[PDB]
Design a protein around this motif. Structure first.
Motif, PDB file in Angstrom:
ATOM      1  N   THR B  66     -14.277 -18.740 -23.698  1.00 20.51           N
ATOM      2  CA  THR B  66     -14.563 -17.445 -23.121  1.00 20.51           C
ATOM      3  C   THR B  66     -14.483 -16.440 -24.279  1.00 20.51           C
ATOM      4  O   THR B  66     -15.125 -15.387 -24.255  1.00 20.51           O
ATOM      5  CB  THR B  66     -13.531 -17.074 -22.031  1.00 20.51           C
ATOM      6  OG1 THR B  66     -13.616 -18.012 -20.947  1.00 20.51           O
ATOM      7  CG2 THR B  66     -13.800 -15.673 -21.499  1.00 20.51           C
ATOM      8  N   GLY B  67     -13.700 -16.786 -25.297  1.00 18.27           N
ATOM      9  CA  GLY B  67     -13.558 -15.917 -26.452  1.00 18.27           C
ATOM     10  C   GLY B  67     -14.866 -15.876 -27.217  1.00 18.27           C
ATOM     11  O   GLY B  67     -15.342 -14.811 -27.611  1.00 18.27           O
ATOM     12  N   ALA B  69     -18.062 -17.026 -26.108  1.00 18.95           N
ATOM     13  CA  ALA B  69     -19.114 -16.533 -25.225  1.00 18.95           C
ATOM     14  C   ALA B  69     -19.134 -15.018 -25.086  1.00 18.95           C
ATOM     15  O   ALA B  69     -20.194 -14.419 -24.901  1.00 18.95           O
ATOM     16  CB  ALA B  69     -18.982 -17.179 -23.844  1.00 18.95           C
ATOM     17  N   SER B  70     -17.963 -14.399 -25.175  1.00 18.93           N
ATOM     18  CA  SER B  70     -17.867 -12.955 -25.031  1.00 18.93           C
ATOM     19  C   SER B  70     -18.144 -12.211 -26.340  1.00 18.93           C
ATOM     20  O   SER B  70     -18.354 -11.001 -26.337  1.00 18.93           O
ATOM     21  CB  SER B  70     -16.484 -12.577 -24.512  1.00 18.93           C
ATOM     22  OG  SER B  70     -15.516 -12.752 -25.530  1.00 18.93           O
ATOM     23  N   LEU B  72     -16.026 -11.759 -28.760  1.00 14.46           N
ATOM     24  CA  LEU B  72     -14.768 -11.350 -29.366  1.00 14.46           C
ATOM     25  C   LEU B  72     -14.383 -12.210 -30.577  1.00 14.46           C
ATOM     26  O   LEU B  72     -13.931 -11.687 -31.587  1.00 14.46           O
ATOM     27  CB  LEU B  72     -13.641 -11.401 -28.331  1.00 14.46           C
ATOM     28  CG  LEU B  72     -12.244 -11.045 -28.847  1.00 14.46           C
ATOM     29  CD1 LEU B  72     -12.228  -9.583 -29.256  1.00 14.46           C
ATOM     30  CD2 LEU B  72     -11.187 -11.325 -27.765  1.00 14.46           C
TER      31      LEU B  72
END
Ligand SMILES: CC(/C=C/C=C(C)/C=C/C=C(C)/C=C/[C@H](CCC(C)(C)O)C(C)(C)O)=C\C=C\C=C(C)\C=C\C=C(C)\C=C\C=C(C)\C=C\[C@H](CCC(C)(C)O)C(C)(C)O
Ligand SMILES: CCCCCCCCCO[C@@H]1O[C@H](CO)[C@@H](O)[C@H](O)[C@H]1O
Ligand SMILES: CCCCCCCCCO[C@@H]1O[C@H](CO)[C@@H](O)[C@H](O)[C@H]1O
Ligand SMILES: CCCCCCCCCO[C@@H]1O[C@H](CO)[C@@H](O)[C@H](O)[C@H]1O
Ligand SMILES: *C/C=C(C)/C=C/C=C(C)/C=C/C1=C(C)CCCC1(C)C
Ligand SMILES: *C\C=C(C)/C=C/C=C(C)/C=C/C1=C(C)CCCC1(C)C
Ligand SMILES: *C\C=C(C)/C=C/C=C(C)/C=C/C1=C(C)CCCC1(C)C
Lengths: 261, 259, 258
Positions: B66-67, B69-70, B72
């Motif tokens: 999720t890190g 994909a986002s 960040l």
């Protein structure tokens, strides 16, 4: 907007700075080869815990120093008004840049190596789990606030405040070494070797906060290249020679430290 | 001056990239559920410890992916002279930015998850604390130096030097897995499953440094999107099917690992 | 934006300065008081609990200084749809888009909670498994929270991170309130958990509620109030709560010794 490559080239082309760095990558590498060789005859799990922890010191060192030499853990920072190094510039890439080439990467070496040195020493001293936890937690605190101080550019007074806090943490580490473990080693049967390494450690570790106060991060009497060699010189004794001496003992006294981890 | 948003959009509008990332988030979530369900019958504190260490893998993986994909934990980095990916350009926002989109977040996945896997394998093998400490410290050094090499832009040689330190660390972890724990498992009575888990592990783990060398981080025979799917494929076997196989054995042999 | 400018922004702003400089001061005094209160413990297990508790305000004084110095503060622009979108704040003497974000707070929590948790876990006679579970998920809770505060690509991602963090929150509160209350019975320490039962639920729940309400979430609370609500909790959780744990431990050394 200084790039990593620009910083990598500034280190190279600066014999003082480059040498204090590449010499430790080299010496760290040799220590490792030597230590693995010296310890390949141990069998007791506890003795081997003392070994890998000690050996990890130069592993951390060679990695982190590579971090510095590569310019990955080096930034340029402008010191706050009143800071003795305020007014510095360094010429990077092909232009003059305000700031001081800051080797914050050294704090990563420390935060990750000191606990390994304390772990080996506490074990050698027959320390219970509470003293190791106290020593290692505060020691890490000491390293983190030290890094925070070097990284602080907003206030000259703030820098010295982080420094004081870091010193307080350092006192806790020193009290354990000089008061608590010095006696626990008698019960563990390692009174003399611990006492030797206890003195070596205390004398060498005290050098760091002095170099910091005297070097570029502090009063700036020692320019960048020199503060760096000061740190590199301490590292060689506090890390490599220290480890060698500790492993020289353990490698001849496996049975004294043997037992339940 | 690239934003997190543009990276977030760049991953989108990129077939192989978005799929290899969003697919893992989904498999990690489904893995967590399946694993919690599989291990609800556990009672022995030592078996539970092995169960939770294992489950933490897909947890680490879902949070970390999720890190990426986002955006960040992704960055645009310019490779050094001589590097096969230097001279590369990437379309971000409304321009052609110099560099390669670097999934540095992957190393945060490997640094936080691999120690859990190792904790799972060591306990299963009856390993003492010294070998767990050794296997875990050198594993962490392995992932962090791997991260260092990926983040290095100053010199092509330095990138392969970090790569070398990371591989040396890898060799220590491997030795413990295939020579030490393989033998400890016998005393633990978990020799059979350990072989299976050991075999799959070593072959899958070897894939990462190979992928590194052949992808955009190395000689770039594999493009960004492709190295990503290579790392994703591997994470699926080493993180989800591997974890399932471990939990499948554990849930049918609680008494063996009793503690 | 510059570190000094962020540092001047907090100073010169009474609301912000007091919510930060007060914690630094209270943590400093708490460390001294805690060390003094525990000067008599003789048992190693008890000592472990005490230093683990003492590290709480140690971490706090460093982290808050991290915020007050500007080191752990940054200016971020919230994504479209976020209630704080269209915000600006005046930092270098000019109008700057975004919201002054105190991401240093998550560092404070990620580093201090494992510490209060180990102290409470040991105090509860917890086995190694529940201690590991509590701490790992707790750390996962703080790290994902930080990720949410730091995400600017989309408003949706932010809340998704928040959910991940909340999931970790419950795993943790569960073992604390339920599991350890039970384990504490065998340890002979069920009372400290019974008496601090309400204090625990309220303060811990207070953090995810302040998040949702503050500038990080729906923003009904500006930056200055988002900081004081976090700083009001920290004072309860890091100083008064640690004091109560220590007051108990000190009067019950023998029993915690085992
Ligand atoms: C970069 C470089 C060299 C890197 C070398 C490395 C990383 C070697 C690590 C060796 C280890 C950890 C050995 C462990 C043994 C104990 C093994 C165990 C307990 C795990 O069974 C023992 C007896 C202490 O030597 C050179 C240039
Ligand atoms: C044991 C660690 C191995 C790393 C050794 C690093 C030394 C190599 C430095 O390379 C040189 O740097 C110059 C400045 O950037 C370039 O102009 C030149 O073309 C490049 O060849
Ligand atoms: C025993 C540790 C000794 C450390 C002493 C730290 C004193 C440094 C104070 O710095 C100065 O503070 C003034 C007021 O804030 C600023 O106006 C000025 O610009 C700044 O340079
Ligand atoms: C009572 C002790 C508490 C110490 C708190 C640390 C805050 C130090 C503030 O110093 C001031 O910072 C300004 C920038 O904001 C400078 O312009 C000014 O010259 C300098 O003097
Ligand atoms: C291998 C590295 C060693 C032994 C490093 C030791 C470092 C210290 C003891 C540093 C201490 C510091 C203070 C007490 C004050 C602030 C500045 C520091 C970080 C240099
Ligand atoms: C997430 C699960 C696994 C099993 C990850 C494994 C990762 C490695 C074995 C990574 C190794 C690397 C090496 C040895 C050399 C440099 C680069 C890497 C970090 C990819
Ligand atoms: C310093 C002491 C305590 C007890 C701190 C507790 C912190 C939390 C319970 C933080 C929780 C969060 C959640 C559940 C959701 C996202 C954001 C937070 C990190 C604020």
């Amino acid at each position: 907007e200084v790039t990593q490559r620009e910083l990598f080239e500034f280190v190279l082309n600066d014999p003082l700075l480059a040498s204090s760095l590449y010499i430790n990558i080299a010496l760290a590498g040799l220590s490792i080869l030597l230590f693995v060789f010296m310890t390949r005859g141990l069998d007791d799990p506890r003795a081997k815990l003392i070994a890998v922890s000690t050996i990890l010191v130069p592993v951390v060192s060679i990695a982190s120093y590579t971090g510095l030499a590569s310019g990955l853990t080096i930034s340029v920072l402008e010191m706050p008004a009143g800071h003795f190094a305020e007014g510095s510039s360094v010429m990077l890439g092909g232009e003059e840049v305000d700031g001081v080439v800051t080797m914050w990467g050294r704090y990563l070496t420390w935060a990750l190596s000191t606990p390994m040195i304390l772990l080996a020493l506490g074990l050698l001293a027959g320390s219970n789990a509470t003293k190791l936890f106290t020593a290692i937690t505060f020691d890490i605190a000491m390293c983190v606030t030290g890094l925070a101080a070097a990284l602080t550019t907003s206030s000259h007074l703030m820098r010295w405040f982080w420094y004081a806090i870091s010193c307080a943490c350092f006192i806790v580490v020193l009290y354990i070494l000089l008061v608590e473990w010095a006696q626990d080693a008698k019960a563990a049967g390692t009174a003399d070797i611990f006492s030797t390494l206890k003195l070596l450690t205390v004398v060498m570790w005290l050098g760091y906060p002095i170099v910091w106060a005297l070097g570029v991060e502090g009063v700036a009497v020692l320019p960048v290249g020199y503060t760096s060699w000061a740190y590199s010189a301490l590292d060689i004794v506090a890390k490599y020679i220290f480890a060698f001496l500790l492993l020289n003992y353990l490698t001849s006294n496996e049975g004294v430290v043997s037992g339940s981890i």
